[PDB]
Design a binder for this molecule. Structure first.
Ligand SMILES: Nc1ncnc2c1ncn2[C@@H]1O[C@H](COP(=O)(O)OP(=O)(O)O)[C@@H](O)[C@H]1O
Ligand SMILES: [Mg+2]
Length: 180
């Protein structure tokens, strides 16, 4: 019956998947769900005035399919001990109200504008980032999300994504040992 559910959010390229993976390998009976696995097909993505595909919005995501994956994990978690841990990591978690009571802990990776743009440029997407995509869409949708975070009623731990991978792992691991 009992579970421990962790949210890891933050801007694109802030190290969410990396952190989730480092935690998983050190925590027993731990799983990870990635929001990145639940994008709608390209044809269902809206395009704005400037021709920018709206990927960085809840409407780009099949959150019904994501919820069923979380329910599948819970059912598995029930038979996993003869406390199971789930880590949900993704760029748009904490503004999704159906999940607002799920979080036992809530982490938010932050990196500044320049570093985010730098990392984002080293990654190859499907389809590739158009020129101007970061300034015309990615960063604006991020600031909109941070504005939406201002009415979150529960505690969120903001993490500095420019710290080394191990530094971030230890910081979160130390926090978790104290919460579990
Ligand atoms: N602590 C860190 N410091 C610097 N770079 C990192 C760190 N963690 C991950 N990265 C790198 O930044 C990029 C984004 O990492 P990833 O974990 O995929 O981010 P996200 O899941 O938030 O998109 C990758 O190239 C990855 O190797
Ligand atoms: Mg990721």
């Amino acid at each position: 019956s009992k579970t421990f559910i962790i949210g890891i959010s933050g801007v694109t390229n802030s190290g969410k998947t990396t952190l989730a993976k480092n935690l998983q390998k050190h925590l027993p009976n731990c799983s990870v769900i990635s929001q990145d696995d639940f994008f709608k097909p390209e044809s269902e993505i809206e395009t704005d005035k400037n021709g920018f595909l709206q990927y960085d919005v809840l409407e780009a995501l099949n959150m019904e399919k994501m919820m069923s994956a979380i329910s599948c994990w819970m059912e598995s978690a029930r038979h996993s001990v003869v406390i199971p841990i789930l880590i949900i990591e993704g760029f748009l978690l904490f503004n999704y109200k159906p999940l607002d009571t799920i979080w036992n802990r809530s982490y938010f990776l932050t990196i500044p504008y320049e570093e985010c743009k730098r990392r984002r440029s080293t990654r190859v997407y499907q389809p590739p980032d158009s020129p101007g995509y970061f300034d015309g869409h990615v960063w604006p949708m991020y600031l909109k999300y941070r504005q939406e975070m201002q009415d979150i009623t529960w505690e969120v731990v903001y993490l500095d994504g420019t710290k080394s991978e191990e530094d971030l792992f230890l910081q979160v691991y130390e926090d978790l040992i104290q919460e579990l």
